[PDB]
């Protein structure tokens, strides 16, 4: 718990400087100390996304979701994990899948950023 979060935060610091190796490693240590926290897994998903590895990001988002449905109290992080899957489709121009996943996210927790990203995709899709 305590050290887990100090591991996550060093990872966070690394990720923000695009030091993805270091982020992943600190995220791993965080996950070994507290396997039931889906945030570390969604954090790794973010790393793979910024690497261009959209597929791994989605895989990791899916795992984060199974861990969170077990917690049962984590609707907002579940929401984040779906919107990250949406984002990863959006990046590949797979807009129908992007939109579907934003709707999943919003249904969990409505947020403005995710609503705005959804409307962007709906407009692109409309006008195609």
């Amino acid at each position: 718990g305590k050290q887990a979060l100090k591991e996550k935060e060093l990872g966070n610091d690394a990720y923000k400087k695009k030091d993805f190796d270091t982020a992943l490693k600190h995220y791993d240590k965080a996950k070994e100390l507290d396997p039931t926290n889906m945030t570390y897994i969604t954090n790794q998903a973010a790393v793979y996304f910024e690497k261009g590895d959209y597929n791994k990001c989605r895989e990791l988002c899916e795992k984060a979701i199974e861990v969170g449905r077990e917690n049962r109290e984590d609707y907002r992080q579940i929401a984040k994990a779906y919107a990250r899957i949406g984002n990863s489709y959006f990046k590949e121009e797979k807009y129908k899948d992007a939109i579907h996943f934003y709707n999943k996210s919003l249904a969990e927790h409505r947020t403005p950023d995710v609503l705005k990203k959804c409307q962007q995709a709906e407009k692109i899709l409309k006008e195609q």
Binding site: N12, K16, A45
Partner: peptide, 8 residues
């Protein structure tokens, strides 16, 4: 330019 995915 490009927005970065946010870490928690």
């Amino acid at each position: 330019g490009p927005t970065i995915e946010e870490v928690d």
